[PDB]
């Protein structure tokens, strides 16, 4: 559902580290529990040699913040990922400009979406630009941090 797409992504240069500045859902149920399986909380981005992207993460799992490796793995499409589950979900960069924010969305028909910046900073710019793409999408749920909570674990 989601058709915006980063053209010419390079994805070498989206390599470090990362702020969830804001996320959004299809669902309400996806986001609303901090436990909720969707609500995480990007680290670091470590694309490999070969061109897939292991992400490292926390998520809120049994009372405590826990450390997430996993891997997307690269497809034909640039800008198109798939993480191996029970079912097929395919991860997306809709947009980046790579030093200051980074636009992503997983999908399945439900749907998760992030606004990325690469400080604890609130970006208006980066903002604008997630709420942009995501007018289309029939999203539900939208949070976002402040700079103190970006600095915490689970943004507590
Ligand atoms: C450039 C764009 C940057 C891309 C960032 C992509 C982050 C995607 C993380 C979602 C995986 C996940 O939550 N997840 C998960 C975690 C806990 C419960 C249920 N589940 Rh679905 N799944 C499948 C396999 C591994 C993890 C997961």
Same mark, same amino acid.
């Given at each position: ?5 980063? @053209?010419? #992504? %390079?994805?070498? @240069? ?12 299809? %669902?309400?149920?996806?986001? %609303? ?5 969707? $609500?995480?909380?990007? !680290?670091?981005? @470590? ?8 992400? /490292?993460?926390? @998520? ?20 198109? *990922?798939?993480?191996?589950? /029970?079912?097929?979900?395919?991860? /997306?960069?809709? =947009? ?14 439900? #749907?998760?979406?992030?606004? #990325?910046? $690469?400080?604890?900073?609130? =970006? =208006?710019?980066?903002? !604008?630009? *997630? %709420?942009?793409? /995501?007018?289309?999408?029939?999203? &539900?749920? $939208? ?11 689970? &943004?507590?």
């Amino acid at each position: 559902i989601v058709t915006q797409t980063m @053209k010419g #992504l %390079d994805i070498q @240069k989206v390599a470090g580290t990362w702020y969830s500045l804001a996320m959004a859902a299809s %669902d309400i149920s996806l986001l %609303d529990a901090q436990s909720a399986p969707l $609500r995480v909380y990007v !680290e670091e981005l @470590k694309p490999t040699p070969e061109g897939d992207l292991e992400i /490292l993460l926390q @998520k809120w799992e049994n009372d405590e913040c826990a450390q997430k490796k996993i891997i997307a793995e690269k497809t034909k499409i640039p800008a198109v *990922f798939k993480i191996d589950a /029970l079912n097929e979900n395919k991860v /997306l960069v809709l =947009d980046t400009d790579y030093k200051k924010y980074l636009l992503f969305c997983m999908e399945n028909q439900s #749907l998760v979406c992030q606004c #990325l910046v $690469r400080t604890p900073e609130v =970006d =208006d710019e980066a903002l !604008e630009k *997630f %709420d942009k793409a /995501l007018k289309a999408l029939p999203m &539900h749920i $939208r949070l976002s941090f402040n700079p103190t909570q970006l600095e915490e674990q689970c &943004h507590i």
